[PDB]
Amino acid sequence: MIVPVRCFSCGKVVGDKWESYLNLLQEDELDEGTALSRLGLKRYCCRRMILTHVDLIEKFLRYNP
Amino acid sequence: EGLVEYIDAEEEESILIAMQPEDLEPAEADVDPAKRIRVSHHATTFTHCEIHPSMILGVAASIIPFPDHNQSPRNTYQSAMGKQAMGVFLTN
Amino acid sequence: NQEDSMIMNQSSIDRGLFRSLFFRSYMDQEKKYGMSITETFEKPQRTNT
Amino acid sequence: PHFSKDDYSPESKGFVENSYLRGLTPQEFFFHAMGGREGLIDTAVKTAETGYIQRR
Amino acid sequence: TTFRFCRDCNNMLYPREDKENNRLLFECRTCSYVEEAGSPLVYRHELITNIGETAGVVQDIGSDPTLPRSDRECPKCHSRENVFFQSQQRRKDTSMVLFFVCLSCSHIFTSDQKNKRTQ
Amino acid sequence: LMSCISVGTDPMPIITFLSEWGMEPLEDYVPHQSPDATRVFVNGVWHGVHRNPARLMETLRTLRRKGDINPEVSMIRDIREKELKIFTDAGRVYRPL
Amino acid sequence: LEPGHAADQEQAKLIRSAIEHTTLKSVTIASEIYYDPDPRSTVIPEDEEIIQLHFSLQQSPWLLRLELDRAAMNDKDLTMGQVGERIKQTFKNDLFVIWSEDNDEKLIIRCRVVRAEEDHMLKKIENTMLENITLRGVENIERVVMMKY
Amino acid sequence: FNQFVDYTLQDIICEDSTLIISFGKIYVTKPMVNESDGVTHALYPQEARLRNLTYSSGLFVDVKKKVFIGRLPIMLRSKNCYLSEATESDLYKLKECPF
Amino acid sequence: GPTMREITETIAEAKKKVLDVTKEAQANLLTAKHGMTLRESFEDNVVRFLNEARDK
Amino acid sequence: NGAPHHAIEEAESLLQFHVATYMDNDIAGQPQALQKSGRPVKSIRARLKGKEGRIR
Amino acid sequence: GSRFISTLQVKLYGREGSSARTIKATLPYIKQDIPIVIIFRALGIIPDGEILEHICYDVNDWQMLEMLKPCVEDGFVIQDRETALDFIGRRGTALGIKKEKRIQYAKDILQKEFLPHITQLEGFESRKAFFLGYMINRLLLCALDRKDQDDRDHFGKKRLDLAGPLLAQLFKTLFKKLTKDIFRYMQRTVELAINAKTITSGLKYALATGNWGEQKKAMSSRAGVSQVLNRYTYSST
Ligand SMILES: [Zn+2]
Ligand SMILES: [Zn+2]
Ligand SMILES: [Zn+2]
């Protein structure tokens, strides 16, 4: 829905790292591999957390109330 | 532009289809051991070419990763389970 | 995790793994039996039978 | 339709040259699916047939 | 066998014996017509058939893409340009012999090594 | 995924086209005269016969490829069986190639 | 197989031959009806030799001719006379049977009826000949395989 | 569905039609709701789902010697449906999912 | 790797053993098995080779 | 009352039908005695007829 | 249009190795099977040889022709069009003696109910007699082991009736029932007001219940045509 607070597997906080991940991709023109790593998402459990996240909240927000 | 055509099963009986374009168009005048063992482009009478063999599959089996690496019934079972699954079905 | 059963990370389940929402919708109508006679949506109470 | 006529070859009549590790070809995949489906039916049919056999 | 019809009727002809002269005749049963026979053969069965073997050998045979090709030289033109089939006689017991058609002289030849045909 | 089902075309433009492109009407068929003649069928109706189907097919195939004949219309030529079957027909399952 | 015969494959072959059902239909290439009015001569020049012999050490002018397959006769290890005698006993004194020898280029059986509306009768005989008649073997016993158990 | 509404529907009217009184051009309205407390207004899918109404439109034929025949349930995203010609932003407003 | 080379070869030689029979039957040299069609006989050998192959 | 005698045989056939169709409604080559709904009507027979009958 | 599935069977009587292997055909509203040759004469093709030419298109095909030799014999007892039509009309029933009844009945069946595609129009005997011939030709090609028996399961010879043709089946049923409702109001007019509900509610019932048949009395009627859309996953939808 929205970026999970913390990695399921190890519990490292990935809650802050969303907007910053997206700016590394867009503005910095970085690839996902280096972007995740710059944010310091070291183990693949944490990488899959952000890398594979679908931010549907953005679609839901588009509806009226 | 007549580069693509619609073919039913009755018409299919009169044509000869190539699977891949590139791997099924020139002719012989090394090979990767890891790769699967393919047939031949020996037919000089090719009328049509397949857009992609994976288009033989439908919605359900199209979610199966590497189904060409599974026993056929195991794919039939996963075709049935994707319905018993869960997630966002619509944003509204 | 024997015979098609599996072990799951309790720690991960907490952190939100495979947790889902579930909704059920219940419905009703004020039916009109004959003429003027109608059902009423109200909080009822112990009155006659 | 991917084969020429009167092709009695291992490749044409459904011999799956490959392993599951290597992956099946499109032809191999379909011929496997053809035989596979016969399994699922035969199973379905036997579950029925054996049911009654047990009861009688 | 051959099929002959009655003129002035176009109806089928039935055999009749000319016992006095010992000869076969074909009479019309719709009219007074009679004619001498051509062959003494009247009926033929053919249980082990060879007719139907090379069916549909249209001159457009070559334009069928579905048909396979070979590089065998023709017994006539010696062109290494062919199209082949086997059945056409869709019986159970049928041999696997191949029937080659030339995309030049248009003559049919068999891969038959045991038998020595002409058609 | 790529499958589609024929919606239903009108056979009349094809029938009108065939007669104008070498189709003898069934009522004028003389089998002893035209013994190699290819039978032309439109929606399981034997309309007549054609003496040079080769050219007729060439014309029809490129007529459909141009879009002048609806792309959903199926047209098959079984050379061996001396037959040309056409389907304007609704309900057929087709794929693109 | 009989106790003292288990090892002998030839004994086994003999029984296979004795029990496996064989019809006239299975050995026949084609069946033909001709109008050969003179029993002493023949319109068919192949049979010109066959007549000359089976007429050295009154009949129907209509002839029923059967061609037999050498290959079929060989798999079923049959003789022309074997086949012939079987036809002979099926119609007894009602059908006149002559046949070519196991050497002659073409394997033929010539049949004439004994003693108005006669041609139509031969077509009935050709059906009884192919369909009805049993050469060797036991009925229903259709294919017999040899196995070294 | 589109083939049926556009073409097939007109044919079904004009094949037995006329009596002893003929049927003409069939007109297919956009989906509507003929309700009491009012008369009729346009019915969008999300409304029909919630209010348990049928998403169908009016059927009109010219009778010779115009006329309401009944209501044809419309297929969603078809030629005659409102969503067919609607943008991503229109759907989100219409509470309909773009997907 | 070498065991894969050995398999690829095993399948290959079986395919050729099949072709050799396929041409033998097409040349009308193949003699039918007792109580079996030439076709029934050929097909039996083919599927026997292609199975022998998978097993090896 | 005024028995037309070929209207009596009519009502008698009807009584025979309802007494028949009450015990067994699924009669051989005869129409089903369907409800208002068109729903066939449970025969006493059908109640006891197995897998879900009183017995089974 | 119409929707009248009258199926025609062209049977080859007698098994392999049976005398008198005759060819008869299943005619709609005609109680008995008619020998092919009788039909051809009832269509105008009267001399057995013209009948043969409509069936076997090659005079060098002695094999196929020997198979039609008994057919000709089977038909021989009927030699004109009237004799042929009366024979068919007798097999229909109704003791309709004779010209304006028996014969006219046969004329009608051949025009309207025999091979209803092609044309149901008057003068198309040539067309229908060639097609019957093509059917016999195809039949014999199989009996002679030339062609193979048809695959009843070939997907190309199958159709899938989607949302539209299904709604079309219903609209025809309902609008024709509405036509009857209109025709009843006109007769009642011993001298507008047409029931709109029949079409609205009709389509509603079927799409609701999934029982593709009018309208509460849907038996025998196709059930499970219309079912609620699955919404667990986008892909499951
Ligand atoms: Zn982690
Ligand atoms: Zn005559
Ligand atoms: Zn040549």
Side-chain angles (χ1 to χ4, degrees), chain E residues 86-87 92-98 111-115, chain I residues 22 25-31 37-40 42-43:
Chain E
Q86 35 142 245
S87 266
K92 302 198 170 185
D93 39 85
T94 331
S95 51
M96 248 155 293
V97 280
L98 294 172
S111 57
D112 213 326
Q113 222 77 68
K114 205 169 258 170
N115 299 273
Chain I
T22 302
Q26 275 164 12
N28 205 214
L29 303 165
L30 189 130
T31 294
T37 305
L38 276 96
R39 307 258 188 168
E40 288 189 316
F42 156 85
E43 281 285 323

Side-chain angles (χ1 to χ4, degrees), chain B residues 5 7-8 11-12 50, chain F residues 1 64-65 74 95 97:
Chain B
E5 220 179 299
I7 294 110
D8 66 330
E11 218 184 329
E12 209 158 27
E50 204 75 58
Chain F
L1 291 172
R64 201 246 266 109
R65 285 168 187 199
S74 168
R95 65 211 217 89
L97 287 158

Side-chain angles (χ1 to χ4, degrees), chain B residues 25-29 41:
Chain B
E25 291 295 42
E28 206 262 333
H41 52 224

Side-chain angles (χ1 to χ4, degrees), chain J residues 23-40:
Chain J
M23 295 175 298
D24 176 12
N25 203 321
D26 356 274
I27 303 174
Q30 242 227 269
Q32 214 126 56
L34 353 90
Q35 198 83 307
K36 11 269 176 194
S37 22
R39 229 244 311 102

Side-chain angles (χ1 to χ4, degrees), chain H residues 34 56-60 67-72, chain K residues 171 174-175 177-178 181-182 192-204 215:
Chain H
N34 39 209
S56 65
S57 70
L59 256 25
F60 291 84
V67 164
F68 184 71
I69 256 70
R71 314 197 119 266
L72 170 71
Chain K
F171 204 83
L174 303 165
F175 187 84
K177 189 260 192 71
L178 178 80
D181 278 21
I182 286 156
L192 68 117
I194 297 125
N195 185 50
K197 278 176 196 174
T198 35
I199 276 165
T200 303
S201 70
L203 303 161
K204 247 223 268 179
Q215 195 210 232

